[PDB]
């Protein structure tokens, strides 16, 4: 259990860090004023997993 | 004078978004975190 928590936590943070550089993430943020709920959904999914 | 010149500003804004995006996210998380805590003394005292 202890190691699994670290594994999941490291993966999600790395996914998020690299997701903010691709065009798709900032093209929408360019088009609208909000993130669109990516972080809220991403956080909720991570906890459930 | 009409194509390359404006592109310099266009790329500048594209290179500024990656950091302006993080500052907004960081402040909102901290700001909304504090609002969760109660404000009135009566509610705060009961929590203790």
């Amino acid at each position: 259990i202890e190691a699994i928590h670290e594994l999941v936590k490291n993966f999600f943070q790395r996914l998020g860090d690299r997701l903010r550089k691709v065009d798709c993430y900032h093209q929408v943020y360019r088009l609208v004023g909000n993130d669109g709920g990516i972080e809220q959904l991403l956080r909720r999914a991570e906890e459930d997993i | 004078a009409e194509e390359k010149y404006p592109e310099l500003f266009a790329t500048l804004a594209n290179d500024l978004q990656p950091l302006c995006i993080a500052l907004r996210q960081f402040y909102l998380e901290n700001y909304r975190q504090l609002d969760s805590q109660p404000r009135e003394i009566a509610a705060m005292k009961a929590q203790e």
Partner: peptide, 21 residues
């Protein structure tokens, strides 16, 4: 101010902050 400066020539807007609530 940055957005206003670019408003004259380019349409690439930035991300503002308002009504945090």
């Amino acid at each position: 101010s940055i957005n206003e400066c670019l408003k004259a020539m380019q349409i690439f807007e930035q991300l503002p902050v308002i009504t945090e609530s």
